[PDB]
A = this chain, B = another copy of it.
Amino acid sequence: AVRFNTRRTGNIQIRLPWYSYLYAVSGALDGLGDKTDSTFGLVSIQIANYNHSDEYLSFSCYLSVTEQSEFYFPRAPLNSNAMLST
């Protein structure tokens, strides 16, 4: 685990290790293969000392890719109705 304080840093740039029991994870699956072979990891955050009277606290996450990662078997891209955003 990492331990931070919101007064000093405001950012954490952290790797995520490849710890899985299977060969590789996939996105385009259904059934019980969708709830097993899609997720690879899981990040959770706990906060303390929050708060005083009236103030909000917001976190935002961002993913990048590394040189140790690999990509296999190109596939037909998503259609124009599955491309969704927040």
Q: Which residues of A contact B (CB under 8 A)?
A: 1, 3-11, 48-49, 52, 55-58, 60, 62
Contacts and interface: CB of A to CB of B under 8 A. Distances in A.
State the number of copies, please: 2
B55 A49 contact: yes
Contact of A10 (B4, B52, B60): B4
A58 to B, nearest CB: 6
Given A48-B58, A49-B58, A56-B49, A3 B8 contact: no
Contacts of A8: 7-10
A80 B4 CA distance: 34
A3 B48 contact: no
A22 B60 CA distance: 35
Nearest to A4: B10
